[PDB]
């Protein structure tokens, strides 16, 4: 049952919205800097995973991806308008995207994921 949008409250990993799957963009909004948005997706077979989050408002935001054991496997690179990055998932399991805004008022966004998901 893939999602197309975040589902509040999703302010922790235990309440993360998901799963996210390739080919189905996910919409949300960072409401203000106190809004933390967590998502999850499942890796079923080893492979490269790519994440692109289009920033559809002004502000500083970024994301980190965690594995099930709270290790960070991937951090965002800002190109100005997209927060992107990729990693090699050596092991199947659930991964979590932690998205937040460190400095901004209001940010819509759109998550796209590609690869072995
Ligand atoms: Ca949230």
PDB file of C-alpha atoms and ligand atoms in Angstrom:
ATOM      1  CA  UNK A   1       0.000   0.000   0.000  1.00  0.00           C
ATOM      2  CA  UNK A   2       2.366   2.817  -1.197  1.00  0.00           C
ATOM      3  CA  UNK A   3       1.794   6.383  -0.018  1.00  0.00           C
ATOM      4  CA  UNK A   4       1.618   9.564  -2.193  1.00  0.00           C
ATOM      5  CA  UNK A   5       1.597  11.948   0.734  1.00  0.00           C
ATOM      6  CA  UNK A   6       2.831  12.331   4.297  1.00  0.00           C
ATOM      7  CA  UNK A   7       0.354  11.454   7.104  1.00  0.00           C
ATOM      8  CA  UNK A   8       0.680  13.606  10.261  1.00  0.00           C
ATOM      9  CA  UNK A   9       1.840  13.036  13.016  1.00  0.00           C
ATOM     10  CA  UNK A  10       5.019  11.697  11.385  1.00  0.00           C
ATOM     11  CA  UNK A  11       7.331  13.549  13.809  1.00  0.00           C
ATOM     12  CA  UNK A  12       9.441  10.498  14.713  1.00  0.00           C
ATOM     13  CA  UNK A  13      10.737   7.296  13.085  1.00  0.00           C
ATOM     14  CA  UNK A  14       8.077   5.312  15.023  1.00  0.00           C
ATOM     15  CA  UNK A  15       5.434   7.421  13.338  1.00  0.00           C
ATOM     16  CA  UNK A  16       7.148   7.733   9.889  1.00  0.00           C
ATOM     17  CA  UNK A  17       4.842   7.810   6.803  1.00  0.00           C
ATOM     18  CA  UNK A  18       5.396   5.019   4.326  1.00  0.00           C
ATOM     19  CA  UNK A  19       6.205   2.965   2.523  1.00  0.00           C
ATOM     20  CA  UNK A  20       7.592   5.111  -0.300  1.00  0.00           C
ATOM     21  CA  UNK A  21       8.160   3.336  -3.625  1.00  0.00           C
ATOM     22  CA  UNK A  22       9.887   4.290  -6.921  1.00  0.00           C
ATOM     23  CA  UNK A  23       7.544   5.886  -9.518  1.00  0.00           C
ATOM     24  CA  UNK A  24       5.085   7.290  -6.985  1.00  0.00           C
ATOM     25  CA  UNK A  25       6.013  10.860  -5.868  1.00  0.00           C
ATOM     26  CA  UNK A  26       5.291  11.761  -2.248  1.00  0.00           C
ATOM     27  CA  UNK A  27       3.996  15.250  -1.365  1.00  0.00           C
ATOM     28  CA  UNK A  28       4.265  16.996   1.958  1.00  0.00           C
ATOM     29  CA  UNK A  29       4.918  20.300   3.572  1.00  0.00           C
ATOM     30  CA  UNK A  30       7.441  21.268   6.261  1.00  0.00           C
ATOM     31  CA  UNK A  31       4.981  23.531   8.219  1.00  0.00           C
ATOM     32  CA  UNK A  32       7.628  25.552   9.989  1.00  0.00           C
ATOM     33  CA  UNK A  33      11.027  24.568  11.572  1.00  0.00           C
ATOM     34  CA  UNK A  34       9.273  22.660  14.411  1.00  0.00           C
ATOM     35  CA  UNK A  35       7.784  20.232  11.904  1.00  0.00           C
ATOM     36  CA  UNK A  36       9.948  17.080  11.563  1.00  0.00           C
ATOM     37  CA  UNK A  37       8.886  14.769   8.672  1.00  0.00           C
ATOM     38  CA  UNK A  38       9.867  11.080   8.815  1.00  0.00           C
ATOM     39  CA  UNK A  39       9.273   8.566   6.044  1.00  0.00           C
ATOM     40  CA  UNK A  40      10.240   4.957   5.476  1.00  0.00           C
ATOM     41  CA  UNK A  41      10.819   2.647   2.581  1.00  0.00           C
ATOM     42  CA  UNK A  42      11.789  -1.028   2.343  1.00  0.00           C
ATOM     43  CA  UNK A  43      14.788  -2.435   0.563  1.00  0.00           C
ATOM     44  CA  UNK A  44      13.958  -6.002  -0.512  1.00  0.00           C
ATOM     45  CA  UNK A  45      17.174  -6.762  -2.495  1.00  0.00           C
ATOM     46  CA  UNK A  46      20.624  -5.146  -2.296  1.00  0.00           C
ATOM     47  CA  UNK A  47      21.051  -2.232  -4.612  1.00  0.00           C
ATOM     48  CA  UNK A  48      21.612   1.458  -5.149  1.00  0.00           C
ATOM     49  CA  UNK A  49      18.894   3.778  -3.789  1.00  0.00           C
ATOM     50  CA  UNK A  50      18.494   7.376  -5.016  1.00  0.00           C
ATOM     51  CA  UNK A  51      16.515  10.098  -3.247  1.00  0.00           C
ATOM     52  CA  UNK A  52      15.460  13.504  -4.673  1.00  0.00           C
ATOM     53  CA  UNK A  53      13.467  15.908  -2.672  1.00  0.00           C
ATOM     54  CA  UNK A  54      12.247  18.932  -4.623  1.00  0.00           C
ATOM     55  CA  UNK A  55      12.025  21.999  -2.419  1.00  0.00           C
ATOM     56  CA  UNK A  56       8.855  23.739  -3.423  1.00  0.00           C
ATOM     57  CA  UNK A  57       9.234  26.725  -1.034  1.00  0.00           C
ATOM     58  CA  UNK A  58      12.081  28.927   0.278  1.00  0.00           C
ATOM     59  CA  UNK A  59      14.132  27.925   3.276  1.00  0.00           C
ATOM     60  CA  UNK A  60      16.992  25.693   4.408  1.00  0.00           C
ATOM     61  CA  UNK A  61      16.075  22.041   4.655  1.00  0.00           C
ATOM     62  CA  UNK A  62      18.007  18.801   4.427  1.00  0.00           C
ATOM     63  CA  UNK A  63      17.531  15.095   4.988  1.00  0.00           C
ATOM     64  CA  UNK A  64      19.342  12.116   6.425  1.00  0.00           C
ATOM     65  CA  UNK A  65      18.595   8.407   5.752  1.00  0.00           C
ATOM     66  CA  UNK A  66      18.839   5.880   8.617  1.00  0.00           C
ATOM     67  CA  UNK A  67      18.886   2.110   8.631  1.00  0.00           C
ATOM     68  CA  UNK A  68      17.018   0.080  11.247  1.00  0.00           C
ATOM     69  CA  UNK A  69      19.864   0.418  13.709  1.00  0.00           C
ATOM     70  CA  UNK A  70      19.965   4.218  13.707  1.00  0.00           C
ATOM     71  CA  UNK A  71      23.082   4.393  11.471  1.00  0.00           C
ATOM     72  CA  UNK A  72      23.108   7.179   8.882  1.00  0.00           C
ATOM     73  CA  UNK A  73      23.656   5.718   5.432  1.00  0.00           C
ATOM     74  CA  UNK A  74      23.080   8.855   3.395  1.00  0.00           C
ATOM     75  CA  UNK A  75      22.998  12.666   3.819  1.00  0.00           C
ATOM     76  CA  UNK A  76      21.425  15.178   1.408  1.00  0.00           C
ATOM     77  CA  UNK A  77      23.316  17.422  -1.000  1.00  0.00           C
ATOM     78  CA  UNK A  78      21.474  20.717  -1.773  1.00  0.00           C
ATOM     79  CA  UNK A  79      21.811  21.859  -5.458  1.00  0.00           C
ATOM     80  CA  UNK A  80      19.730  24.975  -4.738  1.00  0.00           C
ATOM     81  CA  UNK A  81      16.342  23.359  -5.487  1.00  0.00           C
ATOM     82  CA  UNK A  82      16.705  19.656  -4.875  1.00  0.00           C
ATOM     83  CA  UNK A  83      18.042  17.742  -1.918  1.00  0.00           C
ATOM     84  CA  UNK A  84      19.601  14.661  -3.424  1.00  0.00           C
ATOM     85  CA  UNK A  85      21.796  11.714  -2.596  1.00  0.00           C
ATOM     86  CA  UNK A  86      22.169   7.994  -3.075  1.00  0.00           C
ATOM     87  CA  UNK A  87      23.660   5.055  -1.257  1.00  0.00           C
ATOM     88  CA  UNK A  88      24.319   1.355  -1.599  1.00  0.00           C
ATOM     89  CA  UNK A  89      21.979  -0.754   0.507  1.00  0.00           C
ATOM     90  CA  UNK A  90      24.038  -3.896   1.185  1.00  0.00           C
ATOM     91  CA  UNK A  91      21.270  -5.428   3.310  1.00  0.00           C
ATOM     92  CA  UNK A  92      17.517  -5.687   2.943  1.00  0.00           C
ATOM     93  CA  UNK A  93      15.521  -3.869   5.613  1.00  0.00           C
ATOM     94  CA  UNK A  94      13.470  -0.737   6.401  1.00  0.00           C
ATOM     95  CA  UNK A  95      15.126   2.629   5.898  1.00  0.00           C
ATOM     96  CA  UNK A  96      13.886   6.000   7.271  1.00  0.00           C
ATOM     97  CA  UNK A  97      14.238   9.455   5.757  1.00  0.00           C
ATOM     98  CA  UNK A  98      14.434  12.216   8.267  1.00  0.00           C
ATOM     99  CA  UNK A  99      13.428  15.473   6.631  1.00  0.00           C
ATOM    100  CA  UNK A 100      13.520  18.829   8.418  1.00  0.00           C
ATOM    101  CA  UNK A 101      14.001  22.580   7.885  1.00  0.00           C
ATOM    102  CA  UNK A 102      16.841  24.110   9.907  1.00  0.00           C
ATOM    103  CA  UNK A 103      15.915  27.642   8.835  1.00  0.00           C
ATOM    104  CA  UNK A 104      12.716  28.593   7.030  1.00  0.00           C
ATOM    105  CA  UNK A 105       9.103  29.533   7.368  1.00  0.00           C
ATOM    106  CA  UNK A 106       7.057  27.203   5.145  1.00  0.00           C
ATOM    107  CA  UNK A 107       8.192  24.467   2.739  1.00  0.00           C
ATOM    108  CA  UNK A 108       6.215  22.268   0.379  1.00  0.00           C
ATOM    109  CA  UNK A 109       8.177  19.458  -1.181  1.00  0.00           C
ATOM    110  CA  UNK A 110       7.973  16.352  -3.254  1.00  0.00           C
ATOM    111  CA  UNK A 111       9.919  13.124  -2.618  1.00  0.00           C
ATOM    112  CA  UNK A 112      10.997  10.873  -5.514  1.00  0.00           C
ATOM    113  CA  UNK A 113      12.919   7.608  -4.772  1.00  0.00           C
ATOM    114  CA  UNK A 114      14.702   5.381  -7.417  1.00  0.00           C
ATOM    115  CA  UNK A 115      16.495   2.042  -7.489  1.00  0.00           C
ATOM    116  CA  UNK A 116      16.358  -1.094  -5.445  1.00  0.00           C
ATOM    117  CA  UNK A 117      13.142  -0.284  -3.473  1.00  0.00           C
TER     118      UNK A 117
HETATM  119 CA1  LIG B   1       5.776  16.241  10.615  1.00  0.00          CA
END
